[PDB]
Write a protein that binds this ligand. Structure first.
Ligand SMILES: OC[C@H]1O[C@@H](O[C@H]2[C@H](O)[C@@H](O)[C@H](O[C@H]3[C@H](O)[C@@H](O)[C@H](O[C@H]4[C@H](O)[C@@H](O)[C@H](O[C@H]5[C@H](O)[C@@H](O)[C@H](O)O[C@@H]5CO)O[C@@H]4CO)O[C@@H]3CO)O[C@@H]2CO)[C@H](O)[C@@H](O)[C@@H]1O
Length: 180
């Protein structure tokens, strides 16, 4: 995509959970299940505002625990998240360190979703005792997502991806160049 970002409607991903998603990189939070996506897919860098992932909805499915490879299940539910946030390369090498020159993380995954705990998504997705998984994602219509968007936190905030056709397409737009 523009800027060299890798933005695909379906693929393989890793998954973690995080706390504190009330002031996210897209500039609007949301009351439903939300996630951060790795920088190479988000379409922006820290401090540059919203990227083209903002507001898009994805169905997430876990099918493997990389820390316990003998575990065969059960896994959690498939959930639909809205992307509101950025998982930056800096400080998150293991999971969100994908760059244009090495577009997979330490678990071999080209994408990463960090699911926000605050609003309930991680309790539906992660089985107790297994807080990091790999699996798949697929972009869906936000008709499949429940919740409501919060107010704009700063000028330029954007969740317009929530009404966009699936990638490839442009809604909020990408900013800057993808990390090398
Ligand atoms: O940077 C991205 C994002 O990270 C979030 O934090 C992540 C963190 O990055 C992950 O490293 C961390 O992963 C831990 C898993 O949640 C947790 O489930 C897993 O637990 C292992 C455990 O370590 C292991 O000892 C245990 O082994 C047992 C076997 O399963 C059994 O078969 C055997 O009989 O007995 C052994 C030992 O008793 O397995 C479990 C489960 O597999 O450990 C992982 C490594 O610590 O997850 C974090 C949360 O998602 C961070 O919150 C975000 O802010 C950040 O953006």
């Amino acid at each position: 995509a523009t800027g060299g970002y890798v933005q695909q409607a379906t693929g393989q991903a890793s998954f973690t959970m995080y706390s504190g998603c009330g002031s996210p990189a897209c500039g609007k939070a949301a009351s439903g299940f939300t996630a951060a996506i790795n920088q190479l897919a988000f379409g922006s860098a820290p401090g540059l505002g919203a990227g083209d992932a903002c507001g898009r909805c994805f169905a997430l499915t876990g099918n493997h625990d990389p820390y316990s490879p003998n575990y065969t299940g059960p896994f959690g539910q498939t959930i639909v998240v809205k992307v509101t946030d950025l998982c930056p390369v800096q400080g998150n090498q293991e999971f969100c360190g994908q760059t244009t020159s090495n577009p997979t993380n330490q678990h071999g995954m080209p994408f990463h979703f960090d699911i926000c705990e605050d609003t309930g998504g991680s309790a539906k997705f992660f089985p107790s005792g297994h807080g990091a998984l790999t699996g798949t994602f697929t972009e869906v219509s936000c008709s499949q997502w429940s919740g409501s968007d919060g107010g704009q936190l700063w000028n330029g905030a954007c969740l317009s991806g929530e009404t966009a056709p699936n990638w490839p397409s442009t809604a909020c737009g990408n900013k800057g160049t993808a990390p090398s």
